[PDB]
Design a protein around this ligand. Structure first.
Ligand SMILES: CC(=S)N[C@H]1[C@H](O[C@H]2[C@H](O)[C@H]3N=C(C)S[C@H]3O[C@@H]2CO)O[C@H](CO)[C@@H](O[C@@H]2O[C@H](CO)[C@@H](O)[C@H](O)[C@H]2NC(C)=S)[C@@H]1O
Ligand SMILES: CC(=S)N[C@@H]1[C@@H](O)[C@H](O[C@@H]2O[C@H](CO)[C@@H](O)[C@H](O)[C@H]2NC(C)=S)[C@@H](CO)O[C@H]1O
Length: 539
């Protein structure tokens, strides 16, 4: 007779090729990369002969074999490819093999190969678009948005994007290296903790809880190897295999380390850490460099050197050569991008006509042109053109694109930025001819999360009734709302200024549009990005 039918023993069924240690706060102990998951299966035989060989089958294929020596057994073996597998124990002798009922097991890997697709319905005013324009449609999702803003990866309108950028991946470094973080409560200490035991100038994860452990839709089971933003991004990738998801390194508060990268020892260390990071977190499709800014005038008033332009071009070249080597190992296409100042004075510190040869896209940060950081000189924060009242306005979108084009940047590389938020002032007074921008302010507008800044969502739902005037400047291509009694003035992008940006992109054969930041939109901004670049409606 063939052997009796074994019963799989109750026990853990989820395993990981990259393991996350659940009691560790240092990135180096938090993440353990192995060549294969260590899987274990046990079984009992309640009736019949135990056979002479026991096998573990995964989808019918043997992963382990050994002598069957008793009524109970355990197999420990390695599985090097992620997936959900129908696992059976089979007992064999000379007269046949008898296989257990299948138990599904999970072998987790950071491509999300073990995850059900995260395919969620569009929310708020988001309408479905097909990505068939061949243009970039990008937005940033912020790591910390999962807390007070309560905006998680399942709320991203992912079908309506070609690029999703994750803000922000930090670079390790204490005093002198990440001093801009100190202006944010607990933020500098969170990075030191994450970077404990890790060399400076290597990438890390700023909030490992938000990135990997916070329970979220699709990753709420205690034994899910990956949770938080990264676990959901993995499942998002499974739903949207052609979405490019790029880790963004830098930003306003995490740019200080770039200023030291004229030292090739530090630069090589950084590039190698980026390579390792992408080998570790397979769901990412490249890297976005957000260095604010070569030459200084970023958050840190003590950094900035004339050497920064040269450092920037060397960094892009070296990152491209590392990515080409990774593409060759893996067979995937990897992208290299950078978010840059749209101000001509900052643009002219870098030879983008040289760096473009390494880069897929330049994300032109054509926003924050004006704001509550200057109470004397008011203007449109994200306009396409100058306004009629000051045609020589320095900071406009067209001036930033023209600076790049004049360098010799190819128009197809240039991705024009739109704002999903407004900037604003209170107490505006002293203006001429009913144009509030010609006056001066006494403070920042009351903000959604921080002073002087309002989510586009709140502008649309709260500041288009009562005493609020609404004006679309058609010369600038720029909307604004104004409440004269309090002098509250807010400058923002709307469906119409975005449509003008998209038309301009098509006119000038630019690369597409991108936006900061995805949690602040109600759908109006992203619908308009998609429509204006000519993407067709419908799922
Ligand atoms: C007004 C806003 S939304 N400021 C956030 C800021 O954003 C910049 C951004 O860095 C720069 N890079 C782009 C890419 S687009 C461009 O413009 C946006 C908006 O002008 O980014 C800061 C981080 O670099 C944000 O800081 C964080 O602030 C929140 C509190 O509001 C805090 O809880 C987080 O811990 C901070 N994140 C850090 C990494 S320090 C800022 O909100
Ligand atoms: C027209 C110019 S050059 N405006 C800058 C403005 O960029 C600065 O701001 C910052 O904008 C960057 C890039 O988008 C953004 O990352 C920062 O969050 C903004 N920094 C703030 C403190 S808001 C601004 C610096 O205050 O200077 C203007 O001149």
């Amino acid at each position: 007779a063939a052997p009796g039918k074994p019963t799989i023993a109750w026990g853990n069924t989820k395993f990981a090729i990259v393991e996350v240690d659940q009691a560790a706060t240092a990135y180096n102990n938090l993440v353990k990369v192995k060549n294969a998951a260590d899987v274990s299966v046990s079984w009992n035989l309640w009736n019949g002969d135990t056979g002479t060989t026991a096998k573990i089958l995964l989808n019918g294929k043997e992963a382990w074999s050994g002598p069957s020596t008793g009524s109970s057994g355990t197999a420990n073996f390695k599985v090097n490819k992620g997936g959900r597998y129908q696992m059976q124990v089979a007992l064999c002798n000379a007269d046949g093999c008898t296989a257990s009922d299948a138990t599904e097991i999970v072998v987790a890997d950071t491509d999300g190969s073990h995850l059900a697709p995260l395919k969620e319905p569009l929310l708020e005013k988001n309408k479905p678009y097909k990505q068939n324009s061949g243009k970039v449609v990008g937005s940033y999702f912020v790591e910390w948005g999962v807390y007070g803003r309560n905006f998680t990866v399942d709320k991203i309108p992912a079908q309506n994007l070609t690029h999703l950028l994750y803000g922000f991946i930090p670079i390790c470094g204490g005093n002198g290296i990440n001093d801009s973080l100190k202006e944010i409560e607990g933020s500098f200490q969170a990075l030191q903790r994450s970077c404990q035991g890790r060399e400076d100038f290597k990438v890390s994860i700023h909030d490992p809880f938000a990135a990997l452990q916070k329970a979220q839709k699709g990753v709420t089971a205690w034994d899910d190897p990956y949770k938080g933003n990264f676990g959901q991004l993995m499942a998002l990738k499974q739903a949207h295999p052609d979405l490019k998801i790029l880790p963004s390194i830098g930003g306003w508060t995490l740019s200080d380390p770039f200023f030291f990268m004229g030292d090739k020892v530090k630069r090589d260390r950084f590039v190698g850490s980026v390579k390792e990071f992408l080998q570790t977190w397979k769901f990412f499709d490249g890297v976005d460099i957000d260095w604010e800014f070569p030459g200084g005038k970023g958050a840190n008033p003590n950094l900035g050197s004339p050497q920064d332009g040269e450092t920037y071009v060397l960094l892009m070249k070296e990152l491209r050569a590392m990515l080409d080597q990774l593409s060759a190992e893996t067979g995937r296409k990897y992208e290299l991008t950078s978010a840059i100042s749209a101000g001509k004075d900052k643009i002219d510190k870098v030879a983008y006509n040289v760096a473009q040869n390494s880069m897929d896209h330049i994300f032109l940060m054509s926003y924050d042109f004006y704001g509550a950081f200057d109470l004397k000189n008011l203007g449109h924060q994200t306009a396409l053109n100058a306004p009629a009242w000051k045609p020589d306005t320095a900071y406009t979108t067209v001036n930033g694109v023209n600076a790049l084009l004049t360098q010799g940047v190819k128009p197809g590389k240039i991705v024009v930025g739109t704002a999903m938020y407004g900037r604003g002032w209170t107490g505006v007074n002293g203006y001429q001819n009913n144009i509030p921008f010609t006056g001066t302010a006494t403070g920042p507008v009351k903000g959604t999360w921080e002073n002087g800044i309002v989510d586009y969502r709140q502008i649309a739902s709260q500041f288009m009734s009562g005493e609020w005037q609404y004006t679309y400047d058609a010369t600038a291509e720029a909307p604004y709302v104004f409440k004269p009694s309090t002098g509250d003035l807010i400058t923002f992008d709307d469906a119409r200024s975005v449509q003008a940006k998209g038309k301009y992109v098509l006119d000038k054969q630019l690369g597409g549009l991108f936006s900061w930041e995805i949690d602040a939109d109600n759908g109006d901004i992203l619908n308009s990005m998609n429509a204006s670049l000519g993407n067709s409606a419908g799922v």
